[PDB]
Write a protein that binds this ligand. Structure first.
Ligand SMILES: [Cl-]
Ligand SMILES: [Cl-]
Ligand SMILES: [Cl-]
Lengths: 248, 256, 238
């Protein structure tokens, strides 16, 4: 039983739903932990496929900034390391996920919830979805392996505008630039998507798991290495002059 | 060894060389150019020949309405005295050797896709230098439907070429693409209307052949050399995995 | 600067090719001046750095008014390219018009690239009996896809800005009349962003790739030095 997610599994599909609609599905410390437990569970269950999606109008507003409790006794420094270790571990869960992993993007997405899409196997989006990684505005560096994946996926010219200059994309833009697999009209979104997924689940289980493994195994060591770099850099930025300023 | 004069004769292929262009055509139109065991061998000999001849450029293309229906499933003779196990190793070794011929081909290599393409015939496009398609061409790699894993180096090339989000739908979930879709996703260089296809393409290729031969060969060599070791590794991994799949519960089932 | 105009304003260093009479062709001096200009912009107080051409042209590429000669040019080219590999701040191309040769290939190392609709991109190395450079042998296949990079690098096709944008070289295209306006507005905004964040973001993206790119550059230059001494290259130059 989870406090920030709703996890179901049926028809060979495990469905992980973000469930803090009141906060636009902001990811707080607890949800970081719960999403890992959930993914650990889905990796071992009898699902063919695993899906992430958001409850309500938002996919996710990304990392919850109420995580500025700042209360740890060891002040910013302890907090920054702890967050960095947590972030590393969290991203690693996506790098290692052995079964097909699919994002059903119901609405706007932000931050870590967008950068992790670079590690998904497919990504289906409503037309009222948008994609935004404004790390620079907050005096921060990129994460979720996006420093590596996004230039390869989008081309460097297009990735820059999004990661460095913090541009916001529409779903059509994100689909054209290779983040998003396909876009559907919002009124028919859920229907068209789940139909498609129900079909995919009827395909030969081990062929799907093994196909992905052949695609992903050789790249995981690189991605882990990117993740580690990204998180050390970020731990610095969190201690920074500019980051502190920028958050306001 | 394998020098030939104007044209080399084969049972499943037509191989000509003219205007500094060697042209390898699949010739089992009756079977939608399905690639049987013999054609695997013949395509290798043909490539070995084109690598050594005086062509500037090399082309693959199909005879008739199809580019290729991919691997011929009449290759379910199953007759080898050693059963499925011997058959599965033998096919793995062959596939490895075959794919490697594409990895190592030293001159510009171009696919002229006259019509539908399937399976190994599509995955190898990730190793071509250019790929020109008729609008009635389609591209399909349904390995999962057959309980199989990816090959042709597509496990590595297709995510880099198409982006993971787009490669997945084609390799894992077996979607079929139109030539417009394949062009947009980077597999295909360009699409032409079917009625003017042959004309526009061969004009373009006759021009390219007039370019400085060694510049072309060396340009490609600079682009390709550093990546061959990796591709050969991918190919080996893919074929070991596939050998397992061919022995599988699911694959056997899925084929029927 | 004899061949360039270098200004720095609003946290933006702007390096303009200035040989409009020669379609901004890049001669032996400009190679050196561009290096000094970058070394400067890397150290100054600009947030961003921009290249652009004066007049109608971005650059006609290496000025053909240019054994000892072939090694010297190889060493220079290697050193020049490296300056683009190593540039630590955001680096942006404002392509006012036609671009050619080295001036295009380097775009693979830029962070963003904005183009007027009367810009075109052309790398006809094969026509001149030459091999690729600017790290394009590595970057262009990855950016465009092998099937699209080949037609441009090996077969020397010329692209429109729309085509280049679709294939990933170019960030965006603007109508020529509004080009300068729209771009500089956009750049002025970017400059207002947190300076260190921007620098460090790029550093995280680029650092791990630099060693590779430098190796590519070296390999490209040794090959090219051979081509410069070639049967075919001499001929082709006519
Ligand atoms: Cl965190
Ligand atoms: Cl086979
Ligand atoms: Cl030079």
């Amino acid at each position: 039983g989870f406090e920030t997610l709703v996890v179901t599994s049926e028809d060979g599909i495990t469905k992980i739903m973000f469930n803090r609609p009141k906060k636009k599905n902001a990811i707080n410390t607890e949800m970081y932990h719960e999403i890992m437990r959930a993914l650990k569970a889905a990796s071992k269950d009898d699902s063919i496929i695993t899906v992430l999606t958001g409850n309500g109008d938002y996919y996710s507003s990304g990392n919850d900034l109420t995580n500025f409790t700042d209360i740890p006794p060891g002040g910013v420094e302890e907090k920054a390391k702890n967050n960095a270790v947590l972030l590393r571990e969290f991203v690693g869960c996506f790098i290692d996920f052995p079964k097909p992993l699919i994002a059903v993007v119901n609405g706007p997405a932000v931050g870590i919830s967008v950068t992790l899409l670079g590690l998904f196997d497919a990504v289906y989006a409503s037309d009222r979805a948008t994609f935004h990684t404004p790390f620079s505005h907050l005096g921060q560096s990129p994460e979720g392996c996006s420093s590596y994946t996004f230039p390869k996926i989008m081309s460097p010219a297009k990735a820059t505008e999004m990661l460095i200059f913090g541009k916001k994309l529409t779903a059509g833009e994100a689909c054209a630039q290779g983040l998003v697999t396909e876009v559907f009209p919002d009124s028919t979104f859920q229907k068209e998507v789940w139909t498609r997924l129900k079909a995919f689940a009827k395909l030969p289980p081990n062929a799907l798991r093994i196909s992905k493994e052949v695609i992903r195994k050789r790249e995981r060591e690189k991605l882990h290495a990117v993740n580690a770099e990204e998180c050390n850099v970020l731990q610095g930025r969190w201690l920074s002059d500019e980051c502190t300023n920028a958050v306001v």
